[PDB]
């Protein structure tokens, strides 16, 4: 659809069901206090193909799946759990760092709001675009 992102990961414990309350723990969370912790639920779990995804209601641990219902709450990567003090997972650094860079201004003067949401939506799409 227009710019709204399944979330794509693999689960290592428990299960995941369509319509399930979960805590998302972003890259900065620690089990102690206010951190990257949003507590909303999952609209649909869905397993993916050559971009057609097949909604499934329950998924065990050890598989890769998609997750539509989030990405208002994720920015690039995250680890969501069900336990109060389940720590995060190591931050997963790659061998390329964001180095080539240009300035972006909007051609017309008034599309600017469309440009600032785009950067947010762009940050989401690629794992290390800044």
């Amino acid at each position: 659809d227009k710019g709204r992102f399944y979330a794509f990961g693999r689960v290592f414990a428990g299960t995941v069901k369509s319509g399930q309350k979960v805590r998302i723990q972003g890259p900065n969370y620690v089990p102690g206090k206010k951190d990257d912790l949003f507590i909303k639920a999952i609209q649909r779990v869905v397993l993916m193909m050559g971009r057609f995804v097949e909604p499934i209601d329950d998924c065990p641990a050890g598989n890769i799946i998609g997750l539509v219902g989030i990405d208002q709450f994720l920015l690039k990567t995250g680890t969501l759990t069900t336990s109060e003090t389940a720590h995060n997972m190591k931050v997963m650094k790659f061998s390329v760092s964001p180095v080539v860079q240009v300035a972006v201004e909007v051609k017309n003067a008034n599309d600017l709001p469309k440009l600032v949401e785009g950067l947010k939506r762009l940050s989401k799409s690629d794992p290390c675009v800044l």
């Binding site: 900065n28 990257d36 920015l75 008034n110 600017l112 709001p113 600032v116």
Partner: protein
């Protein structure tokens, strides 16, 4: 006789005079003319989300001193640029360039207020969070 028609068959001129003389009522005219929509940077909306173009404080007006801490705001719904007060002690470190921001009216039913020349709106939320919850150490701006 007291200067208006008083016959029993008078009720046409009576009802019609009242209609013309209603135009001398200021807010009746504001309602019929639709200056709600043609003029006035809102559409008649209670509030309007906008975009912070530049932080800018503007002169006070006499009798008082004290710079006034506003922001020129581009409105999302019509790209009109307007300025609005950011009220409180501090409350300008809380805004950066290009923060989304929700502007409310000011109380005087349009047509600017108090210390300040020509500014009719005030900030309430900036990047989704109320100034109050930010001005007190209640809440915190989202992660840039």
């Amino acid at each position: 006789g007291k200067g208006k028609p008083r016959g029993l068959n008078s009720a046409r001129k009576l009802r019609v005079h009242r209609r013309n003389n209603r135009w001398a009522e200021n807010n009746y005219k504001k309602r019929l003319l639709g200056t709600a929509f043609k003029s006035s940077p809102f559409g008649g909306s209670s509030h309007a989300k906008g975009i912070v173009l530049e932080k800018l404080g503007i002169e006070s007006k006499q009798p008082n001193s004290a710079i006034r801490k506003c922001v020129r705001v581009q409105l999302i719904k019509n790209g009109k640029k307007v300025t609005a007060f950011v009220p409180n002690d501090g409350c300008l470190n809380f805004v950066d360039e290009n923060d989304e921001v929700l502007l409310a009216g000011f109380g005087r039913k349009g047509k600017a207020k108090g210390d300040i020349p020509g500014v009719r709106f005030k900030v309430v939320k900036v990047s989704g969070v109320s100034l109050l919850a930010l001005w007190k150490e209640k809440k915190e701006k989202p992660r840039s």
